[PDB]
Amino acid sequence: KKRVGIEALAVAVPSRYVDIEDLARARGVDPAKYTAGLGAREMAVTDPGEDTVALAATAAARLIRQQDVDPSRIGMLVVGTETGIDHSKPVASHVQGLLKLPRTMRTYDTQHACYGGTAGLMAAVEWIASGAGAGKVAVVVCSDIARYGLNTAGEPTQGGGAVALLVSEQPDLLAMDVGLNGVCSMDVYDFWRPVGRREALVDGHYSITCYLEALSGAYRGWREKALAAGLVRWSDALPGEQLARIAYHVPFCKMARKAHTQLRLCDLEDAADAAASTPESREAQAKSAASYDAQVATSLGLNSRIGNVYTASLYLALAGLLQHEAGALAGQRIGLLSYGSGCAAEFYSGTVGEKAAERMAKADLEAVLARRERVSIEEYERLMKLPADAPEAVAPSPGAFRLTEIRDHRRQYAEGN
Amino acid sequence: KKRVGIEALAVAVPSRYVDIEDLARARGVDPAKYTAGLGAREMAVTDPGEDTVALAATAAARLIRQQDVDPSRIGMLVVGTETGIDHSKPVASHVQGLLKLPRTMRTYDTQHACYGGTAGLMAAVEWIASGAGAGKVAVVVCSDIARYGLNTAGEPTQGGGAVALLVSEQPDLLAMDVGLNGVCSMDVYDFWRPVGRREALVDGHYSITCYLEALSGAYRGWREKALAAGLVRWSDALPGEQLARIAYHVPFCKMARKAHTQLRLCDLEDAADAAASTPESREAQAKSAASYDAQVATSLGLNSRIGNVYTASLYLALAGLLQHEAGALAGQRIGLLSYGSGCAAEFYSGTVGEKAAERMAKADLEAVLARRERVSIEEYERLMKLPADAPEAVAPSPGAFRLTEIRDHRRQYAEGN
């Protein structure tokens, strides 16, 4: 029948990273807090030339080249970001110009912290599924630079990058179950970043509680619809165990284990026989290492080497999962949990396509990660102290983009040769 | 059959306005430049308590009350704005909390200058038309405060306010022709507002050319699809003349006459017999006072009393049109042209519903406009010089909202009794 969803994806990362244990030592922190406590390995760091536009355009151009997209088939170009660079002019319009895309497309940005990319994805999917986008494709780019500041609690969860999603009626990566999404949103101050403040404000432990609360509501909403649709059942297997994999928004890699335990607790607490269990027995079952290993563990390879990329984090988890398991997963249904502070969560599902492995091979993700260079904490700090209008005098890699200067309040970019 | 579109709308305006001729005199400008040249009458002015959130929440709460919306049926709450107040936390999340709305909805903001509201509207329409939103409604709020600065060319086109749109399968105001939209977008610097800059940057005459260029492409794209669908024909009537009315984005009221002339020129230049005409004869026909009067003139009553409200301007034009003509227009197809700088235009159509007059009566728009107070240019200037975190010590009207203070970087609001 008709299908809609994600056809392909591409990734862009900053040119530099730091080793997370170096950061710990520079901060007088036990490095195992970062490697074991948070699950981090390497943290992307930026200079001002790697702004939201440059990363988004690099990813979207890479998508078009790698997947041989006909640019004139794009009817929607949406950038999900919380790292906007103008109050009015959207990142999507800059990307359109840098890529020299034609005119017959909607362009806009979507904003809700780390949920903005998913919001744009659903707008593109539903544009197609309504019939309005029939025959065309969308490109939805998640682009962000996560900045908490030197000597702050959030600093080891920084990162940056972009994931460009191709959305179409040929959803080779993920044929989405339209209309089955669960959502949970409420007005909170767990994380925010007032206009003009370069660094975020966060109550990190409260943000974890909000994430898990919103996840629970979103997951339960999806589960009710999936049960009614016959996709999962209350059987000897918990409903959530019937998803082949579940990918979660990853502000730090150990959050996926917390999220999966919470999702399983939702099933265990809601089961018709929950009264026969105890909090202790439910928690021990929910924390099942076997379930985490089977459904979640292989989704974190890219995230652990990049850091938090806000809107893109879930989609880097999807990328890492499919990078290695797309063939195995063809024909199987997986789940995805998007969260953004502020806050909103959305849980959705889809079926991996027969051609997913092909599309992932063309994304050539190990090459993307291999182009990077390690720098010192000293150099990371120097770059952090640069104003946003002071890009380093450095060329972009071939086909990639950098901000070069701001002249008369107009942002100027270069494309690498 | 199935229908989707705008069911109802509500409007919020700032509590104060200035007479536009007073502004001219304070600036040493001939007042006829503003009243005849631009078409302005009154300009909304704000104090910092009337921020994007307060205006959006006032409009959305008014919509819910006036239309007796069941808040638990809302599955999407989207705010289109270019007056965002956080890089991360969306206006939509604040509105959700202020209105005490429940949790089962997507929340996010959409951004592309004055096109952001339309982008969100299409996301909501297509969510419903895909089937995902079947049985539910969306609220899409266009909220903005247009600020160019004292003694600037854009100053007489300032304004502020919000329009909240109810979107549903019962689109009593406008049953939209899904999939027929035309769109035209390209990367330009006609107007923009860098992060942290309170006042916009604009090349006003270039922005007019970009508006008219993008309108032409968007209108032609719609027209091709409408011709193929049989909704309009190349007959003795121009295709565009077969729309009962056309509503245009209104940065200033005289822009509607420019836009309508351009739309008609698109028909006259593209007609199979265009070679028999001259630029002079086509322009004289395009500028037809009879066509402007028949299709456009009655859409500007609210805009002329408020000013530019960026994302909301087109929807204030729709509101003013339907305020007086909804019964006459029931069963008739109208056109709508959205533009945002940066830039993007989208042209779409829909049919006004039999119950549109009922829904407009409940919006009680003359009462909304009557609650305002006139102030001096001196007082407008004093309020302009207030920092964004210094609201006046003034209560909100009943059921309306104001920002009261920012405390520990958290925005605080009050609801009027």
Ligand SMILES: CC(C)(COP(=O)(O)OP(=O)(O)OC[C@H]1O[C@@H](n2cnc3c(N)ncnc32)[C@H](O)[C@@H]1OP(=O)(O)O)[C@@H](O)C(=O)NCCC(=O)NCCS
């Ligand atoms: C994530 C964040 C809250 C961590 O903050 P913190 O208060 O410095 O760290 P914690 O004290 O919570 O310690 C983190 C973990 O490391 C563990 N840990 C600490 N030292 C350790 C060590 N030497 N060896 C092993 N583990 C260690 C802690 O026990 C804790 O484990 P837990 O996850 O089981 O609780 C913080 O970096 C932050 O605010 N980040 C930004 C916001 C964010 O990403 N929030 C996520 C919301 S979903």
Ligand SMILES: CC(C)(COP(=O)(O)OP(=O)(O)OC[C@H]1O[C@@H](n2cnc3c(N)ncnc32)[C@H](O)[C@@H]1OP(=O)(O)O)[C@@H](O)C(=O)NCCC(=O)NCCS
């Ligand atoms: C709209 C804007 C460009 C006007 O700027 P301006 O350069 O000061 O004004 P103009 O010189 O163009 O004059 C405006 C009109 O008033 C007319 N006018 C001037 N003085 C007049 C008078 N005394 N009596 C009658 N008409 C008069 C001009 O002839 C002109 O008419 P036209 O529309 O036929 O060209 C400016 O206010 C601006 O930049 N606004 C913000 C951006 C904007 O809204 N742009 C719209 C893009 S769609």
